[model samples]
Target: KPEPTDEEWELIKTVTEAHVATNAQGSHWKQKRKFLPEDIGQAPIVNAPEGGKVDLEAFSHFTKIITPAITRVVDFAKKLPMFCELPCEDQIILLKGCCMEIMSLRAAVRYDPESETLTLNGEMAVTRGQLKNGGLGVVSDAIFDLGMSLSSFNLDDTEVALLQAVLLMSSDRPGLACVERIEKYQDSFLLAFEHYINYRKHHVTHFWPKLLMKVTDLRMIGACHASRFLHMKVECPTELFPPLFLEVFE
Candidate 1:
């Protein structure tokens, strides 16, 4: 692949910086005004003190190889009983939890492999707070632990794919309290996913290819098609801000 042209690089930097800034505030209110302490606090912070210092080799390597490895786990989590049946808003809450797990995993891998336990940190940590959070965390942890165990057996690909499949089919529709509300939530999830993809695109090429590949694999395994039910609607411009914008540099 060619190095980004000077103009492209400039655009990438400009857009990425703006994207980071937007996510930092949690809401777009800061976009119009200066950032405040609360806005900064609302942004997601991975706290990967150790991982941040590691030599990742290249940006593409981080985006292409590392990101997929992490998000594949997330995609797996998405199909779980707790995730699939929840309202879209609740689902986003779960996803944010999952992201925490990915961050923990990444940090563990980069900083201290011995300390990078995914059982309670990252996504699972956040999933524990809801009224029904314990069961969901247990299921998620079981899948995640399975993934970790598979890593020990040199079944990285198999483990990742298996977890992905489990997440795709883990829902129990009968237990759901609110199904219709998911329509709006699902749209929000897709938009959030898209925003994540776009932000990563500016920083690294081939990120989408890896993500889409996993998504396609999920489809092959009978994962429910998000686009089929969720209709993208026009919301406030705030909705367009990349999720990471809230905490990129914080």
Candidate 2:
């Protein structure tokens, strides 16, 4: 298949830059949320045994960090030509379905292998131990593994950018009204991604297949996240979760 035109590729790069920029500590959303204090200590040490009880504080902290990211993901989605052109209901459905998966992919980009920590807003470094402390032991393990794998790929910002578009264009989302169109959009992204990969590496290679596997990996992580959130909803008080969190994930 032919590669995307220069203009189309430029749009993908620009939108991805905007979305990824929000992950930095100096970003507007993080600052407004008061996520700056060196470390928010959202994942305070909890000696409680895992899986037996929900650590309200840990769950609360996790949700708080992710909620703002969700809003940013929505903005990124709107910037995509195919995404924004969808009917209003279809757009909302697509966002709601894909937000968690997109969040995991975004978070994986922030993973630091040496420290074994996931940084938020480029400042808050959350350790795996901290994730466990927050009652996310299972989820933490999966996320870190994903981070390790993706980090191995040494993906640059542009590759990461278009990969997100490929993910967002999933045609199988349950409530999508424009399934065929969405599939075509996804194909365009995949073709463009392949071309971009070839362009960067100076020739065709195994890179595209390797990256494609992560798409499935992200889906699994998204499922794990949703399951954990459901349990949190049942165990924790309603007020603990951000309304946006519930609105998007619940």
Candidate 3:
């Protein structure tokens, strides 16, 4: 594939710069939710409306409100790989396949909500192993297809240190804890997957800013969130080349 055109490069730069700027402000999670509408006024104000009975309707409505938001995050995640300049059709096909794969796993999680409490659900055990294997496959494939694309740019010592610090902050340990919580509930395979995906989406949106804060200034935190979360870190000086680190991030 050709390198990004001049105009495309300019746009990418603008987007990246903007991301860096926003990431400096604060956690992205809080920023993203700043505009979510609440139903306080529309909600019925009832003091024991049903004789102190449980308001199933209200509870259902509340849960429904966040469903779209969660779904959108998943949609966006599936589209992320398209940004790499694959043919538009190829991108669509790849994303569709990925979404299907993810949804299938998610469905498996839903089959046993109570299974979440079991240290490892059959679905999770299977899915985790699959992901581990798939992760290696992708990395290997990228190395073969885009040799040296990973580490094309050079970073100074300061940049390298900042990258390392941000990485440590954004590591998956915290998110994994949340996954374990859902697992402890004995949730179905689908429910467990939903919990895991939603947990990851929320973490990326919310904690990403804090992760970037360790590297950038506070004012431009939003823009930096993606970079901090998505970028790869190179510890060995020799591995700093584009192809190596590029595949690392993928």
Alpha-carbon lDDT, every model: 0.32, 0.70, 0.27
The digit string of per-residue lDDT tens for model 1 on 1-250 reads 3444454444334333432332222433212332112221121355644211212122112223233343444554543343566666545444433343333332222121243333221122112111012112223333344334334333222222222332222233334445455444444333334444453344445654544444433333222212211211111133432344222111
Q: Looking at candidate 1, what is the lDDT of residue 52?
A: 14
lDDT of 1 at 172: 31
After superposing candidate 1, which stretches have Cα over 4 Å from the reference? Answer: 1-116, 119-172, 175-178, 202-250
lDDT of candidate model 3 versus the reference: 0.27
Give Cα distance to truth, residue 200, candidate 2, Å. 0.8
TM-score-superior candidate, 1 or 2: 2
Kindly list the per-residue Cα lDDT of model 2 for residues 103-154, writing each as its tens digit: 7777677786666677654445677656654655577778778888886688
Predicted structure 3: clash tally: 53
Q: Output the better candidate (1/2) by lDDT.
A: 2
Q: How well does each candidate superpose onto the true structure, as a TM-score?
A: 0.24, 0.84, 0.20
How would the candidate models be sorted by TM-score, starting from the highest?
2, 1, 3
